[PDB]
Design a protein around this ligand. Structure first.
Ligand SMILES: O=c1[nH]c(=O)n([C@@H]2O[C@H](COP(=O)(O)OP(=O)(O)OP(=O)(O)O)[C@@H](O)[C@H]2O)cc1Br
Length: 428
Protein backbone atom coordinates (compact mmCIF):
# COMPACT_ATOMS: atom_id res chain seq x y z
CA UNK A 1 0.00 0.00 0.00
CA UNK A 2 2.64 2.72 0.79
CA UNK A 3 3.79 4.57 -2.35
CA UNK A 4 7.49 5.37 -2.18
CA UNK A 5 9.76 7.09 -4.66
CA UNK A 6 13.37 5.97 -4.96
CA UNK A 7 15.38 8.82 -6.48
CA UNK A 8 18.54 7.64 -8.18
CA UNK A 9 21.38 9.83 -9.49
CA UNK A 10 24.13 9.25 -12.05
CA UNK A 11 26.64 6.44 -12.69
CA UNK A 12 26.59 2.74 -11.71
CA UNK A 13 27.97 3.23 -8.20
CA UNK A 14 24.92 5.30 -7.51
CA UNK A 15 22.45 3.37 -9.67
CA UNK A 16 22.97 -0.20 -8.46
CA UNK A 17 22.08 0.33 -4.76
CA UNK A 18 18.97 2.34 -5.78
CA UNK A 19 17.87 -0.51 -8.10
CA UNK A 20 18.52 -2.96 -5.28
CA UNK A 21 16.54 -0.82 -2.82
CA UNK A 22 13.64 -0.31 -5.23
CA UNK A 23 13.49 -4.07 -5.80
CA UNK A 24 13.68 -4.96 -2.09
CA UNK A 25 10.86 -2.52 -1.25
CA UNK A 26 8.60 -3.76 -4.11
CA UNK A 27 8.67 -7.37 -2.82
CA UNK A 28 7.73 -9.13 0.41
CA UNK A 29 8.06 -8.66 3.32
CA UNK A 30 8.00 -4.85 2.77
CA UNK A 31 5.39 -4.94 -0.01
CA UNK A 32 5.53 -1.28 -1.09
CA UNK A 33 4.24 0.43 -4.15
CA UNK A 34 7.54 1.69 -5.70
CA UNK A 35 8.31 4.38 -8.24
CA UNK A 36 11.93 4.62 -9.40
CA UNK A 37 13.09 8.04 -10.56
CA UNK A 38 15.83 8.09 -13.22
CA UNK A 39 17.83 11.17 -14.18
CA UNK A 40 17.95 11.51 -17.98
CA UNK A 41 19.87 11.54 -20.10
CA UNK A 42 22.11 8.89 -18.59
CA UNK A 43 25.83 9.68 -18.40
CA UNK A 44 26.81 6.52 -20.39
CA UNK A 45 25.15 4.24 -22.99
CA UNK A 46 25.75 1.19 -20.74
CA UNK A 47 23.41 2.38 -17.96
CA UNK A 48 20.50 2.61 -20.44
CA UNK A 49 20.85 -1.11 -21.14
CA UNK A 50 20.82 -1.99 -17.37
CA UNK A 51 17.92 0.32 -16.40
CA UNK A 52 15.70 -0.97 -19.22
CA UNK A 53 16.46 -4.58 -18.18
CA UNK A 54 15.50 -3.76 -14.57
CA UNK A 55 12.01 -2.33 -15.30
CA UNK A 56 11.22 -5.35 -17.54
CA UNK A 57 12.10 -7.74 -14.72
CA UNK A 58 10.14 -5.57 -12.19
CA UNK A 59 6.90 -4.61 -14.00
CA UNK A 60 5.26 -3.55 -10.70
CA UNK A 61 7.91 -0.77 -10.29
CA UNK A 62 7.08 2.37 -12.26
CA UNK A 63 9.78 4.31 -14.08
CA UNK A 64 9.79 8.09 -13.71
CA UNK A 65 12.21 10.06 -15.85
CA UNK A 66 13.60 13.37 -14.63
CA UNK A 67 15.30 15.44 -17.30
CA UNK A 68 18.32 17.50 -16.40
CA UNK A 69 20.39 19.12 -19.19
CA UNK A 70 24.02 18.09 -19.56
CA UNK A 71 26.28 20.89 -18.43
CA UNK A 72 28.78 22.24 -20.95
CA UNK A 73 32.26 20.67 -20.58
CA UNK A 74 35.21 22.60 -19.15
CA UNK A 75 39.01 22.28 -19.43
CA UNK A 76 39.50 21.80 -15.70
CA UNK A 77 36.38 20.14 -14.41
CA UNK A 78 35.77 16.37 -14.24
CA UNK A 79 32.74 15.33 -16.39
CA UNK A 80 31.15 13.21 -13.62
CA UNK A 81 31.51 16.13 -11.18
CA UNK A 82 29.84 18.45 -13.68
CA UNK A 83 26.94 16.02 -14.03
CA UNK A 84 26.51 15.60 -10.24
CA UNK A 85 26.47 19.43 -9.91
CA UNK A 86 23.71 19.57 -12.53
CA UNK A 87 21.63 16.97 -10.66
CA UNK A 88 22.21 18.80 -7.34
CA UNK A 89 21.25 22.09 -8.98
CA UNK A 90 18.08 20.48 -10.38
CA UNK A 91 16.81 19.04 -7.10
CA UNK A 92 14.46 21.88 -6.18
CA UNK A 93 12.29 20.75 -9.05
CA UNK A 94 11.55 17.39 -7.36
CA UNK A 95 8.78 18.15 -4.90
CA UNK A 96 6.46 19.45 -7.68
CA UNK A 97 7.47 16.61 -10.00
CA UNK A 98 6.96 14.05 -7.21
CA UNK A 99 3.74 15.51 -5.73
CA UNK A 100 2.15 15.30 -9.24
CA UNK A 101 2.24 11.47 -8.83
CA UNK A 102 -0.65 9.28 -7.86
CA UNK A 103 -1.29 7.78 -5.50
CA UNK A 104 -0.03 9.94 -2.57
CA UNK A 105 3.65 9.35 -1.89
CA UNK A 106 4.41 8.22 1.70
CA UNK A 107 8.18 8.82 1.52
CA UNK A 108 11.09 9.58 -0.75
CA UNK A 109 14.39 7.64 -0.61
CA UNK A 110 16.85 9.91 -2.35
CA UNK A 111 20.37 10.39 -3.53
CA UNK A 112 22.42 12.78 -1.42
CA UNK A 113 22.56 15.14 -4.44
CA UNK A 114 18.80 15.88 -4.01
CA UNK A 115 19.02 16.77 -0.29
CA UNK A 116 18.92 20.57 -0.44
CA UNK A 117 16.23 20.54 -3.14
CA UNK A 118 13.95 18.07 -1.39
CA UNK A 119 14.44 19.47 2.12
CA UNK A 120 14.09 23.25 1.47
CA UNK A 121 11.44 23.46 -1.32
CA UNK A 122 7.66 23.06 -0.97
CA UNK A 123 5.73 20.85 -0.77
CA UNK A 124 7.68 19.18 2.05
CA UNK A 125 7.83 15.42 1.46
CA UNK A 126 9.18 12.88 4.01
CA UNK A 127 12.71 12.36 2.70
CA UNK A 128 15.17 9.66 3.70
CA UNK A 129 18.64 10.39 2.30
CA UNK A 130 20.12 7.10 1.00
CA UNK A 131 23.90 7.48 0.96
CA UNK A 132 25.79 5.01 -1.25
CA UNK A 133 29.04 5.15 0.75
CA UNK A 134 30.22 3.79 4.12
CA UNK A 135 28.87 5.17 7.37
CA UNK A 136 32.52 6.16 7.97
CA UNK A 137 32.81 8.27 4.84
CA UNK A 138 29.28 9.59 5.26
CA UNK A 139 30.25 11.07 8.66
CA UNK A 140 33.10 12.92 6.95
CA UNK A 141 30.71 14.12 4.22
CA UNK A 142 28.34 15.50 6.87
CA UNK A 143 31.24 17.49 8.37
CA UNK A 144 32.42 19.10 5.11
CA UNK A 145 30.53 22.41 5.77
CA UNK A 146 32.55 22.67 9.03
CA UNK A 147 35.92 22.47 7.16
CA UNK A 148 38.13 25.58 7.40
CA UNK A 149 42.63 23.74 7.63
CA UNK A 150 44.60 20.78 6.19
CA UNK A 151 47.47 21.18 8.71
CA UNK A 152 46.17 18.35 10.94
CA UNK A 153 43.69 15.46 10.95
CA UNK A 154 39.99 16.22 11.04
CA UNK A 155 38.77 15.10 14.44
CA UNK A 156 35.03 14.70 14.80
CA UNK A 157 34.42 14.26 18.56
CA UNK A 158 33.56 10.63 19.32
CA UNK A 159 34.94 9.27 16.04
CA UNK A 160 38.37 8.02 15.20
CA UNK A 161 40.24 10.94 13.60
CA UNK A 162 40.35 11.26 9.79
CA UNK A 163 43.98 11.49 8.63
CA UNK A 164 44.58 14.22 6.03
CA UNK A 165 45.94 11.48 3.70
CA UNK A 166 42.44 9.93 3.43
CA UNK A 167 40.37 13.10 3.09
CA UNK A 168 39.64 13.92 -0.54
CA UNK A 169 41.79 17.01 -1.21
CA UNK A 170 38.87 18.91 -2.84
CA UNK A 171 37.09 19.01 0.55
CA UNK A 172 39.55 21.67 1.77
CA UNK A 173 38.56 23.95 -1.15
CA UNK A 174 34.99 25.32 -0.61
CA UNK A 175 34.62 26.38 -4.29
CA UNK A 176 35.84 23.08 -5.74
CA UNK A 177 32.88 21.80 -7.81
CA UNK A 178 32.54 18.59 -5.75
CA UNK A 179 32.89 20.35 -2.40
CA UNK A 180 30.31 22.96 -3.42
CA UNK A 181 27.44 20.50 -3.92
CA UNK A 182 28.63 18.41 -0.97
CA UNK A 183 28.27 21.46 1.27
CA UNK A 184 24.95 22.57 -0.22
CA UNK A 185 23.40 19.16 0.38
CA UNK A 186 25.13 18.21 3.68
CA UNK A 187 23.88 21.43 5.28
CA UNK A 188 20.35 20.04 5.05
CA UNK A 189 20.88 16.40 6.22
CA UNK A 190 19.36 17.53 9.53
CA UNK A 191 15.95 17.93 7.78
CA UNK A 192 15.94 14.36 6.41
CA UNK A 193 13.83 11.82 8.30
CA UNK A 194 16.82 9.49 8.37
CA UNK A 195 20.06 8.59 6.61
CA UNK A 196 19.87 5.12 5.04
CA UNK A 197 23.24 3.40 4.62
CA UNK A 198 24.10 0.29 2.66
CA UNK A 199 26.06 -1.19 5.57
CA UNK A 200 25.39 -3.31 8.64
CA UNK A 201 25.80 -2.89 12.37
CA UNK A 202 28.56 -5.43 12.87
CA UNK A 203 30.57 -4.04 9.90
CA UNK A 204 30.83 -0.45 11.21
CA UNK A 205 30.08 -0.79 14.92
CA UNK A 206 32.28 2.05 16.21
CA UNK A 207 30.94 4.69 13.84
CA UNK A 208 27.34 3.60 14.27
CA UNK A 209 27.48 3.33 18.10
CA UNK A 210 28.91 6.85 18.27
CA UNK A 211 26.13 8.14 15.99
CA UNK A 212 23.47 6.22 17.89
CA UNK A 213 24.59 7.75 21.21
CA UNK A 214 23.28 11.24 20.22
CA UNK A 215 26.57 12.93 21.22
CA UNK A 216 28.37 12.74 17.87
CA UNK A 217 27.15 14.77 14.86
CA UNK A 218 24.02 15.41 16.87
CA UNK A 219 22.34 17.43 14.07
CA UNK A 220 22.08 14.32 11.86
CA UNK A 221 18.78 12.39 11.94
CA UNK A 222 18.89 8.66 12.74
CA UNK A 223 21.51 6.86 10.68
CA UNK A 224 19.97 3.55 9.67
CA UNK A 225 21.95 0.61 8.21
CA UNK A 226 19.84 -1.32 5.72
CA UNK A 227 22.49 -3.48 4.03
CA UNK A 228 23.97 -5.37 2.48
CA UNK A 229 21.18 -4.91 -0.05
CA UNK A 230 21.06 -8.22 -1.92
CA UNK A 231 21.46 -8.16 -5.63
CA UNK A 232 19.25 -8.23 -8.64
CA UNK A 233 18.96 -10.94 -11.24
CA UNK A 234 19.24 -10.42 -14.98
CA UNK A 235 17.93 -12.25 -18.09
CA UNK A 236 21.51 -12.87 -19.25
CA UNK A 237 23.62 -14.99 -16.87
CA UNK A 238 27.35 -14.34 -16.45
CA UNK A 239 29.18 -15.77 -19.51
CA UNK A 240 32.25 -16.88 -17.52
CA UNK A 241 30.44 -19.15 -15.11
CA UNK A 242 31.27 -22.40 -16.95
CA UNK A 243 34.93 -21.35 -17.10
CA UNK A 244 34.84 -20.63 -13.35
CA UNK A 245 33.20 -24.07 -12.88
CA UNK A 246 36.39 -25.62 -14.29
CA UNK A 247 38.80 -23.92 -11.85
CA UNK A 248 39.73 -25.21 -8.37
CA UNK A 249 37.97 -23.77 -5.31
CA UNK A 250 39.20 -20.35 -4.20
CA UNK A 251 41.81 -20.24 -6.99
CA UNK A 252 40.67 -17.24 -9.06
CA UNK A 253 41.45 -13.60 -8.27
CA UNK A 254 38.73 -11.16 -9.34
CA UNK A 255 40.23 -7.77 -10.27
CA UNK A 256 38.18 -4.60 -10.74
CA UNK A 257 38.80 -0.89 -10.27
CA UNK A 258 35.18 -0.03 -11.00
CA UNK A 259 33.29 1.43 -13.95
CA UNK A 260 35.31 4.53 -14.78
CA UNK A 261 38.78 4.83 -16.34
CA UNK A 262 40.98 4.35 -13.27
CA UNK A 263 44.59 3.64 -14.18
CA UNK A 264 47.14 4.94 -16.66
CA UNK A 265 48.62 2.76 -19.43
CA UNK A 266 51.82 2.41 -17.37
CA UNK A 267 49.77 1.23 -14.33
CA UNK A 268 47.77 -1.28 -16.42
CA UNK A 269 51.00 -2.67 -17.86
CA UNK A 270 52.54 -3.04 -14.44
CA UNK A 271 49.46 -4.78 -13.08
CA UNK A 272 49.58 -7.09 -16.11
CA UNK A 273 53.21 -7.96 -15.41
CA UNK A 274 52.49 -8.56 -11.71
CA UNK A 275 49.49 -10.81 -12.48
CA UNK A 276 51.66 -12.71 -15.01
CA UNK A 277 54.43 -13.25 -12.44
CA UNK A 278 51.90 -14.37 -9.80
CA UNK A 279 50.69 -17.21 -12.06
CA UNK A 280 47.24 -16.70 -10.46
CA UNK A 281 44.10 -17.48 -12.40
CA UNK A 282 42.11 -14.24 -12.68
CA UNK A 283 39.18 -12.34 -14.13
CA UNK A 284 40.15 -8.72 -14.70
CA UNK A 285 37.69 -6.00 -15.76
CA UNK A 286 40.13 -3.75 -17.68
CA UNK A 287 39.14 -0.13 -18.45
CA UNK A 288 40.55 -6.47 -27.41
CA UNK A 289 43.16 -4.78 -29.67
CA UNK A 290 44.17 -1.97 -27.23
CA UNK A 291 45.38 -4.53 -24.69
CA UNK A 292 47.47 -6.71 -27.00
CA UNK A 293 49.87 -3.86 -27.88
CA UNK A 294 49.51 -2.23 -24.43
CA UNK A 295 50.89 -5.42 -22.83
CA UNK A 296 52.81 -6.59 -25.91
CA UNK A 297 52.07 -9.94 -27.55
CA UNK A 298 54.18 -12.13 -25.20
CA UNK A 299 52.58 -10.82 -21.97
CA UNK A 300 49.06 -10.57 -23.43
CA UNK A 301 49.25 -14.27 -24.42
CA UNK A 302 50.61 -15.34 -21.00
CA UNK A 303 47.79 -13.39 -19.26
CA UNK A 304 45.18 -14.96 -21.57
CA UNK A 305 46.50 -18.44 -20.70
CA UNK A 306 45.76 -17.93 -17.00
CA UNK A 307 42.83 -15.50 -16.92
CA UNK A 308 40.06 -13.53 -18.54
CA UNK A 309 40.55 -9.94 -19.68
CA UNK A 310 37.07 -8.50 -19.89
CA UNK A 311 35.22 -5.21 -20.25
CA UNK A 312 32.19 -6.21 -18.19
CA UNK A 313 30.95 -8.93 -15.84
CA UNK A 314 27.97 -9.66 -13.65
CA UNK A 315 30.06 -8.86 -10.55
CA UNK A 316 27.77 -10.43 -7.96
CA UNK A 317 27.75 -13.71 -9.90
CA UNK A 318 31.55 -13.70 -10.03
CA UNK A 319 31.90 -12.91 -6.32
CA UNK A 320 29.37 -15.61 -5.43
CA UNK A 321 31.31 -18.29 -7.33
CA UNK A 322 33.22 -20.87 -5.22
CA UNK A 323 36.27 -20.64 -7.55
CA UNK A 324 36.85 -17.00 -6.58
CA UNK A 325 39.34 -16.76 -3.70
CA UNK A 326 40.02 -13.02 -3.50
CA UNK A 327 39.08 -9.59 -4.83
CA UNK A 328 41.58 -6.90 -5.85
CA UNK A 329 39.42 -3.78 -5.56
CA UNK A 330 39.51 0.02 -5.49
CA UNK A 331 36.92 -0.29 -2.63
CA UNK A 332 34.01 1.54 -4.16
CA UNK A 333 31.39 0.92 -1.51
CA UNK A 334 29.02 -1.23 -3.59
CA UNK A 335 31.92 -3.53 -4.38
CA UNK A 336 32.85 -3.69 -0.68
CA UNK A 337 29.30 -4.67 0.30
CA UNK A 338 29.00 -7.25 -2.52
CA UNK A 339 32.25 -8.82 -1.32
CA UNK A 340 31.16 -8.60 2.36
CA UNK A 341 27.97 -10.50 1.56
CA UNK A 342 29.90 -13.35 -0.11
CA UNK A 343 32.81 -13.34 2.41
CA UNK A 344 35.44 -12.72 -0.27
CA UNK A 345 38.77 -11.37 1.06
CA UNK A 346 39.74 -8.01 -0.41
CA UNK A 347 43.11 -6.69 -1.46
CA UNK A 348 42.34 -2.98 -1.22
CA UNK A 349 44.07 -0.58 -3.64
CA UNK A 350 42.03 2.65 -3.19
CA UNK A 351 42.53 5.61 -5.54
CA UNK A 352 40.30 8.59 -4.72
CA UNK A 353 37.13 9.95 -3.16
CA UNK A 354 35.69 7.64 -0.50
CA UNK A 355 37.98 4.74 -1.42
CA UNK A 356 40.75 5.22 1.16
CA UNK A 357 38.33 5.50 4.09
CA UNK A 358 36.38 2.52 2.64
CA UNK A 359 39.64 0.56 2.48
CA UNK A 360 40.26 1.47 6.14
CA UNK A 361 36.82 0.12 7.05
CA UNK A 362 37.53 -3.06 5.04
CA UNK A 363 40.73 -3.63 7.04
CA UNK A 364 39.12 -2.71 10.38
CA UNK A 365 36.28 -5.17 9.70
CA UNK A 366 38.65 -8.04 8.83
CA UNK A 367 37.26 -8.29 5.30
CA UNK A 368 40.65 -7.52 3.73
CA UNK A 369 43.93 -5.65 3.83
CA UNK A 370 44.81 -2.24 2.53
CA UNK A 371 48.11 -1.90 0.74
CA UNK A 372 48.63 1.82 1.39
CA UNK A 373 51.40 2.48 -1.15
CA UNK A 374 50.35 -0.03 -3.83
CA UNK A 375 50.68 2.62 -6.52
CA UNK A 376 54.43 3.11 -5.77
CA UNK A 377 55.16 -0.44 -7.05
CA UNK A 378 52.19 -2.15 -8.65
CA UNK A 379 54.03 -5.18 -9.98
CA UNK A 380 55.72 -5.83 -6.61
CA UNK A 381 52.56 -5.09 -4.60
CA UNK A 382 50.52 -7.78 -6.36
CA UNK A 383 53.38 -10.34 -6.45
CA UNK A 384 53.89 -9.92 -2.68
CA UNK A 385 50.31 -9.73 -1.32
CA UNK A 386 48.17 -11.87 -3.65
CA UNK A 387 49.25 -15.16 -2.04
CA UNK A 388 48.26 -13.96 1.43
CA UNK A 389 44.90 -12.80 0.03
CA UNK A 390 44.42 -16.06 -1.89
CA UNK A 391 45.67 -18.30 0.97
CA UNK A 392 43.78 -20.56 3.33
CA UNK A 393 44.64 -18.37 6.34
CA UNK A 394 43.44 -16.05 9.19
CA UNK A 395 42.17 -13.42 6.68
CA UNK A 396 40.09 -15.96 4.72
CA UNK A 397 38.44 -16.98 7.97
CA UNK A 398 37.82 -13.38 9.10
CA UNK A 399 36.34 -12.63 5.65
CA UNK A 400 34.16 -15.74 5.92
CA UNK A 401 32.80 -14.53 9.29
CA UNK A 402 31.96 -11.10 7.76
CA UNK A 403 29.91 -12.99 5.12
CA UNK A 404 28.01 -14.87 7.83
CA UNK A 405 27.29 -11.61 9.70
CA UNK A 406 26.31 -9.85 6.44
CA UNK A 407 23.82 -12.59 5.58
CA UNK A 408 22.52 -12.56 9.20
CA UNK A 409 21.94 -8.79 8.97
CA UNK A 410 19.51 -8.97 6.02
CA UNK A 411 17.86 -12.28 6.97
CA UNK A 412 14.50 -12.07 8.74
CA UNK A 413 15.17 -10.80 12.27
CA UNK A 414 18.57 -9.37 11.34
CA UNK A 415 19.85 -5.94 12.32
CA UNK A 416 19.31 -4.44 8.83
CA UNK A 417 16.09 -6.32 7.96
CA UNK A 418 14.51 -5.14 11.21
CA UNK A 419 15.71 -1.58 10.58
CA UNK A 420 14.17 -1.46 7.14
CA UNK A 421 10.93 -3.14 8.27
CA UNK A 422 10.58 -0.48 11.01
CA UNK A 423 10.96 2.31 8.48
CA UNK A 424 8.39 0.79 6.16
CA UNK A 425 5.96 -0.08 9.00
CA UNK A 426 6.01 3.54 10.16
CA UNK A 427 4.97 4.78 6.72
CA UNK A 428 1.74 6.57 5.83
O1 LIG B 1 32.19 -5.19 -14.59
C1 LIG B 1 31.52 -4.70 -13.69
N1 LIG B 1 30.33 -5.32 -13.39
C2 LIG B 1 29.48 -4.84 -12.39
O2 LIG B 1 28.43 -5.46 -12.18
N2 LIG B 1 29.84 -3.75 -11.69
C3 LIG B 1 28.96 -3.19 -10.64
O3 LIG B 1 29.06 -1.74 -10.65
C4 LIG B 1 28.62 -1.27 -9.36
C5 LIG B 1 29.17 0.05 -8.75
O4 LIG B 1 30.55 0.00 -8.42
P1 LIG B 1 31.35 0.64 -7.09
O5 LIG B 1 30.74 1.40 -5.96
O6 LIG B 1 32.07 -0.56 -6.43
O7 LIG B 1 32.64 1.31 -7.77
P2 LIG B 1 32.58 2.64 -8.66
O8 LIG B 1 33.84 3.42 -8.51
O9 LIG B 1 32.23 2.32 -10.14
O10 LIG B 1 31.35 3.43 -8.06
P3 LIG B 1 31.58 4.36 -6.80
O11 LIG B 1 30.75 3.91 -5.50
O12 LIG B 1 32.94 4.81 -6.47
O13 LIG B 1 30.65 5.61 -7.24
C6 LIG B 1 28.87 -2.43 -8.41
O14 LIG B 1 27.57 -2.75 -7.94
C7 LIG B 1 29.43 -3.55 -9.28
O15 LIG B 1 28.84 -4.77 -8.93
C8 LIG B 1 31.06 -3.10 -11.97
C9 LIG B 1 31.91 -3.58 -12.96
BR1 LIG B 1 33.47 -2.69 -13.25
Amino acid sequence: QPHVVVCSGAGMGHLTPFLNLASALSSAPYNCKVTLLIVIPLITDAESHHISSFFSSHPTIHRLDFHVNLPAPKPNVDPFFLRYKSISDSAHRLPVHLSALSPPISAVFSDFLFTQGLNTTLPHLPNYTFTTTSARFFTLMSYVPHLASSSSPVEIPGLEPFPTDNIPPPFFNPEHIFTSFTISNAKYFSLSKGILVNTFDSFEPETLSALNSGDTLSDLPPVIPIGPLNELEHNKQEELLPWLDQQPEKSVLYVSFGNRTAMSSDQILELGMGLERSDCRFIWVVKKSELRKLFGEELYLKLSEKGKLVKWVNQTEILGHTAVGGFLSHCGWNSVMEAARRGVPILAWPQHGDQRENAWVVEKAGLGVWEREWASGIQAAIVEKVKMIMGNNDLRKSAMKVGEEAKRACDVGGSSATALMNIIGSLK
